[PDB]
From a paper:
Gram-negative bacteria from the Bacteroidota phylum possess a type-IX secretion system (T9SS) for protein secretion, which requires cargoes to have a C-terminal domain (CTD). The T9SS is a specialized OM shuttle of protein cargoes that includes a rotary motor, a translocon, an OM-associated scaffold and an attachment complex. T9SS transport requires a C-terminal domain (CTD) of 70–100 residues, also known as the ‘T9SS signal’, which contrasts with the short unstructured signal peptides of other secretion systems. The CTD is apparently necessary and sufficient for T9SS secretion.
Eventually, the structure was solved in the primitive space group P3121 by single-wavelength anomalous diffraction (SAD) with data collected at the selenium K-edge, but it could only be refined in P31 after the diffraction data had been detwinned. All this notwithstanding, the final structure, with six protomers in the crystallographic asymmetric unit (a.u.), was backed by solid Fourier map density and exhibited good validation parameters. The two LKK sheets are arranged with an intersheet angle of ~35° and have Greek-key connectivity. Finally, the C-terminal segment of strand β7 encompasses the sequence K787–L–I–K–K791, which is found at the C-terminus of five unique serine- and metal-dependent peptidases secreted by the T9SS of [name] in addition to [name], collectively named ‘KLIKK-peptidases’. Structure similarity searches with LKK identified the CTDs of PorZ (Z-score 10.0, rmsd 1.7 Å, 72 aligned residues, 18% identity; see) and PorU (Z-score 9.9, rmsd 1.9 Å, 78 aligned residues, 19% identity) as the closest structural relatives. We found that, in addition to the much longer Lβ2β3, LKK lacked one residue in motif Lβ3β4, which is relevant for T9SS function in P. gingivalis (see §2.3), and the conserved glycine was replaced with methionine. Moreover, the mutant strain evinced substantially less extracellular PPAD activity. This confirms that the CTDs are not functionally interchangeable between P. gingivalis and [name] due to the disruption of motif Lβ3β4, despite both species belonging to the Bacteroidia class.
Author numbering: -2 to -1, 706 to 791
The structure:
């Protein structure tokens, strides 16, 4: 499993992509499994907002959040992926 956030740095909308790494080719697949997951937006060791979706591609609204250092965390089937995200 892989997490990609675009663009970098974050504007009002961050596109999150959760692709499956194909076990044969090693290429990134946009899977039709569409399993539910949770996206958490963290800053200063506080979970500020969360979103729940089945879409591997999701636009995160960062509206209302000030400029600074954030962490985006995906919780999917027990597995977590966390990435530093700078909001300008
Ligand atoms: Cl944090």
């Amino acid at each position: 499993g892989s997490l990609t956030l675009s663009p970098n740095p974050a504007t009002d909308v961050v596109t999150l992509q959760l692709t499956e790494t194909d076990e044969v080719s090693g290429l990134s697949v946009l899977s039709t499994e569409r399993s539910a997951y949770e996206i958490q937006i963290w800053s200063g060791m506080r979970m500020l907002r969360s979103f729940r979706t089945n879409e591997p591609t999701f636009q995160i609204p960062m509206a209302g959040l000030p400029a600074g250092l954030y962490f985006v965390r995906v919780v999917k089937n027990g597995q977590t992926y966390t990435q530093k995200l700078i909001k300008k």
